Design a protein around this ligand. Structure first.
Ligand SMILES: *[C@@H]1O[C@H](CO)[C@@H](O[C@@H]2O[C@H](CO)[C@@H](O)[C@H](O)[C@H]2NC(C)=O)[C@H](O)[C@H]1NC(C)=O
Lengths: 196, 186, 211
């Protein structure tokens, strides 16, 4: 039994966009949750199926660690039952989620004075995403009256729009990295227990 | 059992279209997301396209954006891929893969189909002199890769690797322990 | 996009442990999947989430994900495990499924072999059309690394020189082809040309003659 890649996920030099969020499956390692608080000045640490201090006691089989960046005023949207542009078109948690949502400010790392348009979010979609569904399609949205034929002509808009983080001023619009830890029952021989 | 059979392609001129298909069985075809991975002769694996479980989400690579279109037919569990607006650099062995989970691992594979983009056609089965058996230099001068009509004795005839020879023609040589004129397929 | 780095080729002794790495920037934050592709068939999954194996894979296959490089630990590599391996990761880019450059894991079965060169003067029946024709063929080599070495009496030749990629044999001495297109009007009239091959530092003094 070795250590978990928790320290290699929260301190990534490049974070995934909300429409291309990674899912690092964690198995066969001892979960040392003491390293989480060292690099996560959490703005919201609401756990919905576990306790933050009892993580070193319970044990799970497989742990999934999502990673995505969203707007500052959209941190509350990453929660079971929430709505919004992110909670409905980019990342939606189920009503029976069992884990914790970790989010911290990253204005000193994920922001540039010339505009960091490398992070994009989806604006519109014909239907909401299923729980834990990844949306990779970049096809031009159609207005319905006429097809766009792959070009963004009249009444044809691109589905991906950048955030454009501005480090000058403004609260609620700063870049915030979000990591979501998912725990499944999975009644099978466990592999990732606490450091006991 | 899990079976994936890709329909063969063939020799096609540039700017034409190649119609491929991938029949799948043994697993739930309507649940897993099907992908496409091509492999050029002597090159590594390269991703082509991804089709959603219902056909809504579609994505392509930058080198094949615009001209290629991916589609699936869950009514008969056949994965399709329209290779419209072919290019010389599209000659690759297309493999029919299946995505396992959100982490992005493939568990099911086929056998691959051969799609060759050639610029010429056949010129006739010109046999060669200097033939036990025959020791000719050319056999079935296909412009690119095909080679048959081994007129030598099948007891110990050798099969030498095919050469590209982009000059315009290709020659197949075979040796085995008078002249040679046997030729049946044009 | 992401750039997975693989070694060009890794050689391992039979029964030992072979380790094929796969480096990358911050590769620990994502899962590395491996595939086994045998020459003439499709790749087969071996280890997907850096730790687990599907049904039908022996326990000798294993992997790990730590630091800035992956690791595929394959122990007790028999002679039947000669295949190519590829990595796969999901990146924060426009999402192309980045595959590695490929690594050919070869098992040292035979120490060395001597190639055989076959060459005979072409008859005059092909001279009616005056087509470019070379007859020397080289085969019977185990290492599989041969290069075309047409020597113009210990000197290069014009119109460029190309080497045909070798093909896999039936687990024995391989074969190759060393013929291309060049003017046959000056074939063996004098020292202008002579066909030889450099099999990793070894040549064949053929001393060919016409007729
Ligand atoms: C997490 O990442 C940050 C930034 O990549 C690391 O911060 C560096 O820390 C070293 C030593 O503490 C300094 O010399 C560098 O100047 C820091 N870089 C920046 C940009 O501040 C931090 O060390 C990492 N945490 C680890 C490795 O545990």
């Amino acid at each position: 039994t070795n250590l978990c890649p928790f320290h290699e996920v929260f301190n990534a030099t490049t974070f995934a966009s909300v429409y291309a969020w990674n899912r690092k499956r964690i198995s066969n390692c001892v979960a040392d949750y003491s390293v989480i608080y060292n690099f996560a000045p959490f703005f919201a640490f609401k756990c919905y199926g576990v306790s933050p201090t009892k993580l070193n006691d319970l044990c799970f089989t497989n742990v999934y660690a999502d990673s995505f960046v969203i707007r500052g005023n959209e941190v509350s949207q990453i929660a079971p039952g929430q709505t919004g542009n992110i909670a409905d078109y980019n990342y939606k948690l189920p009503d029976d989620f069992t884990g914790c949502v970790i989010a911290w400010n990253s204005n000193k790392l994920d922001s540039k004075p010339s505009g960091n348009y490398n992070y994009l979010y989806r604006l519109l979609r014909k239907s909401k995403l299923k729980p834990f569904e990844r949306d990779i399609s970049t096809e031009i949205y159609q207005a319905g009256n006429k097809p766009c034929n792959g070009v963004a002509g009249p009444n044809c808009y691109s589905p991906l729009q950048s955030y454009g983080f501005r480090p000058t001023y403004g609260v609620g619009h700063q870049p915030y990295r979000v990591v979501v830890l998912s725990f499944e029952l999975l009644h099978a021989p466990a592999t990732v227990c606490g450091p006991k | 059992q899990v079976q994936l059979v890709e329909s063969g392609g063939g020799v096609v001129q540039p700017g034409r279209s190649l119609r491929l298909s991938c029949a799948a069985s043994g697993f739930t075809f309507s649940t897993y997301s099907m992908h496409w991975v091509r492999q050029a002769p002597g090159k590594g694996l390269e991703w082509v396209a991804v089709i959603s479980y219902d056909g809504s989400n579609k994505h392509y690579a930058d080198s094949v954006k615009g001209r290629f279109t991916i589609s699936r037919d869950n009514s008969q569990n056949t994965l399709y891929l329209q290779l419209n607006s072919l290019r010389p650099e599209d000659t690759a062995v297309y493999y029919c893969a299946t995505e396992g989970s959100l982490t992005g691992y493939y568990r099911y594979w086929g056998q691959g189909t051969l799609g060759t983009v050639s610029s010429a056609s056949t010129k006739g089965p010109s046999v060669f002199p200097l033939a036990l058996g025959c020791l000719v230099k050319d056999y079935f001068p296909e412009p690119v890769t095909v080679s048959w009509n081994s007129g030598a004795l099948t007891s110990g005839v050798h099969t030498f690797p095919a050469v590209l020879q982009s000059s315009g023609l290709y020659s197949l040589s075979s040796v085995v322990t008078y002249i040679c004129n046997v030729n049946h397929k044009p | 996009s992401y750039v997975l780095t693989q070694p060009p080729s890794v050689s391992v002794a039979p029964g030992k442990t072979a380790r094929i790495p796969c480096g990358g920037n911050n590769i620990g934050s994502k899962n590395v999947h491996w595939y086994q592709q045998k020459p003439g068939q499709a790749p087969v999954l071996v280890v997907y989430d850096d730790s687990d194996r599907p049904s039908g894979i022996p326990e000798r296959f294993s992997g790990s994900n730590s630091g800035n490089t992956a690791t595929l630990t394959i122990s007790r590599v028999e002679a039947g495990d000669e295949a190519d391996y590829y990595c796969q990761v999901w990146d924060s880019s426009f999402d192309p499924w980045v595959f590695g450059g490929g690594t050919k894991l070869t098992v040292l079965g035979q120490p060395k072999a001597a190639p055989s060169v076959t060459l005979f003067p072409p008859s005059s029946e092909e001279l009616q059309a005056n087509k470019a024709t070379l007859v020397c063929l080289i085969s019977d080599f185990y290492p599989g690394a041969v290069t075309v070495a047409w020597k113009a009496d210990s000197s290069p030749v014009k119109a460029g020189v190309e080497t045909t990629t070798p093909s896999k044999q039936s687990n024995n001495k391989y074969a190759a082809s060393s013929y291309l297109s060049l003017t046959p009007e000056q074939w063996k009239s004098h020292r202008s040309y002579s066909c030889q091959v450099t099999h990793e530092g070894s040549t064949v003094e053929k001393t060919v003659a016409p007729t």
